[PDB]
Design a protein around this ligand. Sequence first.
Ligand SMILES: Nc1ncnc2c1ncn2[C@@H]1O[C@H](COP(=O)(O)OP(=O)(O)OP(=O)(O)O)[C@@H](O)[C@H]1O
Ligand SMILES: Nc1ncnc2c1ncn2[C@@H]1O[C@H](COP(=O)(O)OP(=O)(O)O)[C@@H](O)[C@H]1O
Ligand SMILES: [Mg+2]
Ligand SMILES: [Mg+2]
Lengths: 467, 238, 466, 14, 54, 487, 255
Amino acid sequence: TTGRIVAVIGAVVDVQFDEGLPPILNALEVQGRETRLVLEVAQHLGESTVRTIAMDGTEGLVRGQKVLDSGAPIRIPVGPETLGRIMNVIGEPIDERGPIKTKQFAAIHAEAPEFVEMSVEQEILVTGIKVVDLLAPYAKGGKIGLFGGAGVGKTVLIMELINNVAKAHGGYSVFAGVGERTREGNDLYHEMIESGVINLKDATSKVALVYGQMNEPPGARARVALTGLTVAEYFRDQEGQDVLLFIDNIFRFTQAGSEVSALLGRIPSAVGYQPTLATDMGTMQERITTTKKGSITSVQAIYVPADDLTDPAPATTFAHLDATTVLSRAIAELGIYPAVDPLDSTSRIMDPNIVGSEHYDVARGVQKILQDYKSLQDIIAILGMDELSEEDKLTVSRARKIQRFLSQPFQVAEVFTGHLGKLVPLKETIKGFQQILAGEYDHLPEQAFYMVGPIEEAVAKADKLAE
Amino acid sequence: LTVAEYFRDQEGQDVLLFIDNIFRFTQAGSEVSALLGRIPSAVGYQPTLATDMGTMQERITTTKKGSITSVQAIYVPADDLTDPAPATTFAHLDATTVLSRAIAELGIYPAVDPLDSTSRIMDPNIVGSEHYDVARGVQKILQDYKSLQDIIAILGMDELSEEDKLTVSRARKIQRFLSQPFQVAEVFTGHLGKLVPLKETIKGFQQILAGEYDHLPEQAFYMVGPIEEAVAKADKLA
Amino acid sequence: TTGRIVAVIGAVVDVQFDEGLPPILNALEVQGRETRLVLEVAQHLGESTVRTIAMDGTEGLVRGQKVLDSGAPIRIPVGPETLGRIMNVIGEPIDERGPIKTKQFAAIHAEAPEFVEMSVEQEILVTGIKVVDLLAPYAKGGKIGLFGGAGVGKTVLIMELINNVAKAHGGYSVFAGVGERTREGNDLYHEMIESGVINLKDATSKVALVYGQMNEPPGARARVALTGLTVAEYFRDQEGQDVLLFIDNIFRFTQAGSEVSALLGRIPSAVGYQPTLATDMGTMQERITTTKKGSITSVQAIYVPADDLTDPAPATTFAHLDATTVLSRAIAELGIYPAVDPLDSTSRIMDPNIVGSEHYDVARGVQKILQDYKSLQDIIAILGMDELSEEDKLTVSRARKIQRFLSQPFQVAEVFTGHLGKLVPLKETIKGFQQILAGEYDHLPEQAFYMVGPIEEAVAKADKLA
Amino acid sequence: LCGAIHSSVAKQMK
Amino acid sequence: ESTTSEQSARMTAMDNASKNASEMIDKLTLTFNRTRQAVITKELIEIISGAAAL
Amino acid sequence: DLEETGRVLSIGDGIARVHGLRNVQAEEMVEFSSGLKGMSLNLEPDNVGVVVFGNDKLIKEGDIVKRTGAIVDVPVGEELLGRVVDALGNAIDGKGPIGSKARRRVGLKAPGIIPRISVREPMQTGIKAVDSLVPIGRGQRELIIGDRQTGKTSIAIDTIINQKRFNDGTDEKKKLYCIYVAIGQKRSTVAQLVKRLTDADAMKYTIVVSATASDAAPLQYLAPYSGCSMGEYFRDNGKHALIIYDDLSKQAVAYRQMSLLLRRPPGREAYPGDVFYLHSRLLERAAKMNDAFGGGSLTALPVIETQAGDVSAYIPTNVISITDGQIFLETELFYKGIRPAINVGLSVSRVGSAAQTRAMKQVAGTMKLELAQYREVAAFAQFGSDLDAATQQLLSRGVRLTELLKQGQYSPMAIEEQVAVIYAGVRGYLDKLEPSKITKFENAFLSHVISQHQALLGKIRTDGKISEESDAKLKEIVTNFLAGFEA
Amino acid sequence: YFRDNGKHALIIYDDLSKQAVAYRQMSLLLRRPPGREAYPGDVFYLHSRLLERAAKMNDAFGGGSLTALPVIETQAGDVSAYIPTNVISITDGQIFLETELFYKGIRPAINVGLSVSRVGSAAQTRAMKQVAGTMKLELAQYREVAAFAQFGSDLDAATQQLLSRGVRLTELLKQGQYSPMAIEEQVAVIYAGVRGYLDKLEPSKITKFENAFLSHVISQHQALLGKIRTDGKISEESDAKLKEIVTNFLAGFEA
Ligand SMILES: Nc1ncnc2c1ncn2[C@@H]1O[C@H](COP(=O)(O)OP(=O)(O)OP(=O)(O)O)[C@@H](O)[C@H]1O
Ligand SMILES: Nc1ncnc2c1ncn2[C@@H]1O[C@H](COP(=O)(O)OP(=O)(O)O)[C@@H](O)[C@H]1O
Ligand SMILES: [Mg+2]
Ligand SMILES: [Mg+2]
């Protein structure tokens, strides 16, 4: 079947087919372009005309240009031949390393796993991050989400998690860069090559890349997420291997949709977001899950518009996670990095019958003292201080030390912390905080914990801070 | 505007253009814009708010053939300076005088906010170092008072360091010394119209900043002309 | 005429007619349904088509279905035989006690009284309740804002007002529940039968009920207020009585409006309220007035959204209120029943050129003495209730005596607390507190002035207390 | 915070 | 005399301090409600306009 | 055949403008050429706005749409107990098909005003914080409202668990069946959910209707109605049923989608003007039928997710005004250690003692009063530089009672056990014990009486209140236990 | 052009907020539906596509670069606006200026706390990295401690020292207009502060000290500045030399 473009406005193009109207979700190959421009059928307006979203620029298109129906949705190459290869939204090799020689391709659009395919196994994934492992530990094969505003450390944290987990990972991994800074992409690409995670010579690459940065049209950003997902889905099912799915930033999926929304003739919903926000997010997120075939530990960086966590985008994302690490700008401003908010992060495995009673007690105890201090803050805000009882002045001091003991110098942010990267094992994490709660280290200055590793480094630093 | 343009160019006469109120120009636009069949922009204003204001304002300017000193009154709807009307006007002025309703309610007239009004002439190599230093010094103390205003509003002025009390006192004297009785407002000020020369204005604030008057009642600086009247009034108050 | 449905979108049904296109506000009876589905015309699209708002579920409607034009707006059964019956928006009996055998029918849509019909004199409706008549006198033919949640004896105060008004004014009452919770609807009905304001055996039913259950569409809930108002209008415009109209609540009346407005495709104004917020409210409130025949005083329960009084809904309602009765739980906890806060409850007619000089000054004195005592409340448990001067110690006792003398046993509580209800006339109410302020009873125990009627009873009680 | 007590006597004690 | 004067000034201080606090609260509640209504109206207008342009 | 059939004019965003079907009824189910079902929500002069019940990928222009005839109805019966079904009752737990014997329509009018009776029979949740201060009755709509991760869903689950007690006994009148409806939630959570209920063996009397995010808006829209009908069956047949709507917020969001796409006039937050009507007619179905009408009851515990605690939001306001109570959960209390984080001070129940066990009423009232006084002076606690013994004592009783309101998750205790622990604090046998140890005491004490004192706990039930004898017995137990605790 | 030709260019977009407004007009007049704040749904792309063009090309691609510095005007300091947020999520950092600081003498009115560089020391000479390094994190903690100690909160040696360093460094960050300092000169003045040789100096005197010290080295110790400009790092000798210069000079300054 062959259609012709009849209207072009933005990334939304309408094509009229003489015969054989292509079903929705199908791709269309715009004929007459030096660049492969794919159009995804989104609506069937009628009068043998269909509305499509462009996966690239519509600039240059002319009304009447012939378009061919591929006869199937956007298919991309999946398999081990993608590892170490940077893939385009529509599966094209944008790494310059020739074509991706895969035996079979896969459609990016698929159905979500049935209810009788989910798992109920929860295992703690020691990422090596104090705040995380202590308060909100991740689950090996559980959906994870890093929330935060523009400038809190989401990207740096996801990179850190990659450094730790992705490297010492038995299996393949996939990284999809949805609407972000290409700069970051180039950096990550070269950094992984250095860490041998991506070998440009011998086949030892484990991380497969997919990108569609902020320089791409709404259509590309709205699908790159699915593209990367499909890649991970293959390794999950037809391979039965542990797949790591890192997405940054997933919010761009929703943003891309709101842009074309108006051009698709939809009535604005709350905060001007598309009325199909939830469903669109659901059809996608639900595919990003662990099945009885394979496990996928997904780590997604979720942007928070104007830091308003009540914004329909991040607000709807919360219900699609098992572990939430909310980043606060306030804590970031204080200087505590990662800027994880200890009173807004939670984990599904934080049950005393999963992470253990001792761990649960320590985590809760830390959260409590912090909350208590938070309540004492506004109390003395502009009312002196010398009135609080020994207990209050004790909780304040301890809470502050714990607060500053949450900051851990990240290897990734070494050029931002001006310190060496440290990793603290869960055991030492529980140990240290448990001891601080016990008030054992109440004879050390607050700064002795500010940006350190194990409690040993805090004590040693304390004595070192003789002057 | 056209009338002014003529004198400016065709006669090179230094034209003084006074418009009151220019904001009405934009307001009228919104009224007809709806009827023009355009899609409303933010706050329902005409989507062409920026351009319209531009083509007009850009005609009210000094050319190499003639000079025009324009003084345009800009009404701020609902006292919202962030409103698309006044906000878009700001970048068209070389000197801005933002009148604060709060200051007016404090009897300080002209109710000019000393920390919001700006001018591109405020440069040491233009108005002089002495003028700039005094100007910034005055703006600084006033700015340091605003921060203290919070604590003052709750724990009074008792929980303040003697230093802060000094800044507060001086700031209030300066704050009042900024008020000047207008002849066109004598029926309200109840004071004869006083005009103060730049030289006396600079001197007056220099002395107060130097603390040379840290002993005179603040009211002695209310509705006065040159600093001399402040001292004189102080004596009359005894 | 018989039209045909040409479109059904939610609760908005468009019907087309060939001959005789029905006017606006006119009712339409859909044919081919078990439950009578009434459509109210509210627009003339054109090309012999009219847009209507369904009064109930439109589920099952098919394009082409016949619709009989009633030729007149929604009419409801009016007359004395509606007392003790729970009526539907369109008048259908929902209490399952058969059809309302009425001979007179009235439409819920009617123009408000003409200017020449407006009474130019402001009278006070003696409810016979000290706290009210004294401090917040109900304006005869005025709107009163009943502020109170639940568990504050709100229902009891309602049942008392009815009993008293009918017993002391021969005027029946009507209760229009806008957005009534079916649960509370059943409770209220049975609770009313117990109080005797409604009877099943003998016809002593002094109230008529109209329920706009939350189950019904916006159009139904928005009209139930009118329906109840029409049932009350009858008594005034026909029997010339002083009817009492209860609207619980008024906020849900406005909400139903914004909703209907929204469905009709009208652009929402500030905070999303319908543009016709002013008119919708006005037209309904304007019917509640005093004419040269009778009067209709309306006690409307008020819900202040987000506790914002500047919000359009409450802002508009206040523009039609004449008095307020703030049922405070704190007061109820102190055992003062009715729990009417003597400092919030206010009335506009509480002006000397209306309620009289004596009444005004006495009421003022009561409010003032209570305020003064309140100021001392702090000093009491701080410096010590003894440091207070004689006058202060006198204000304390007197204020406490008055505070207690504000409680009054309701007849509704007779079939519960086993205490005879009192109907204290305005005269004795004034004289009573007037004497307390004078200190004529500064020698009797405070308990004597608790749950009593006329001051005389308090005196006798004091003797019993010895 | 105890009003003008400390400052008052302070600006007299020294 | 110290203890007395101290409790006197403190009592009067806090007395007026809480009073000022209360006023500040009511003022913020009013400004809050204003922002609250404005917010709803703004979003709603943006929705209506966006719809009335299809 | 523009009569019983039609042709799709346009299809997109789940909306299919079918041309024809001049004999379809409003809200009637239709079938597309792909076999997909749909519901004609919009009946317009030249088209029928049909909402697709699935991926409209299998829908194109010219697709012949035919009328099915039957309206949306779901199977109902005890054969659904222990089964996980979708919004349309179809079994999704894979354990074969359900015995679809009886079938009830999802859209039915709520029971009449007269056919009901005053709520009396208590609906013991198991959480002492609720049963004592916020009692719930059979035939009441109690709203569980709070922000994300406050504990909303947990309050529901424990309530369902506690029912196992009565459901294992011979007390047929106390037996309460439960139905959990999931809307918008992910299958992962729903999986852990049913797994949890199975571990608690509560599933044997729990029906789980699920409508995940991958499900079309209309399915998520029907899920709560179908689940309701499944419960109404019990109610009408005299049996007692409980249903939780998790969440109505997510359902409203999915419904708004249909309206906005159908180009229906958007109101506040873009929600349609009948979004209230949506929840009202649903929640009003819950009721307590009179003996003449079986005598059953359907208690509903809907969940609403608030944003930044803005209860004045459109949907939250709608449901709060339709319910007979609200259980406020504040995350602040959670981190403070208050678990469940049920803000008793704001939580209410318009029913109250009316549906509370007499035994509980006795100790519930005193606790409530004491807690109130505590809150009135709570602020003065942290600034207790110099306070009078009276205020101090109020703070003492306060904190202790607050500790007693704490309860572990997945462990709903019996009413006798609740009144027992309440007795300890209310009577003051904890005013001296440090608050930190109170939590430990409750555990040791309760476990002790449940062991060597089952008779006492039982007597409380038998007497229906704390009898003078049991009052004296408990006195000797608490005093002797106290010394043993601090020695 | 310069970028793809090995040359390095710099571009300032003043003002991007005004461009957006213009675009809004264009789009609205095209009858395209008005979005949030009437701005079109692709306002983000309007700026992303632009800023993303600025990049650093590898040697194979000429090794040229295009550094972009977009300007954005915030209304009433409300960064919760549509455009402000957009741009902040595209750039590799921001520099927020506040009128409050400006009047308070902090000129440039750069708010250290609301400004970051998503590149860091990877754009600083070793010399600057040796002095600057972690001074940012230091100032952050300093401001927090100062805010928490806005009264006599029995400050110990550690906290007091922190406050002292903070105030000193703050003064050294003040700089006028049209007076760009050389990297080595900046390193010298920042050195005196970070190393803490001015900890025993009155903050008001620092204002003049900087200029005096600057002229002192530029005149006589020009060789030191010259070396640093070449080595791009403070050598051991340079560190020792600077130490003797600042200590003695400062000592003589406090005559
Ligand atoms: N009784 C309890 N005691 C202690 N912790 C509890 C209790 N109930 C719930 N929690 C904690 O609260 C967490 C959140 O519970 P839950 O998922 O029910 O909250 P929610 O607000 O319903 O979340 P969502 O909004 O995602 O449904 C649990 O993971 C658990 O850690
Ligand atoms: N763990 C960290 N330690 C120190 N600085 C950090 C850390 N994470 C982020 N930062 C600082 O914050 C900046 C922004 O972080 P980034 O995560 O890139 O922003 P975003 O969260 O918006 O993607 C970084 O350039 C760095 O200066
Ligand atoms: Mg990032
Ligand atoms: Mg939940």
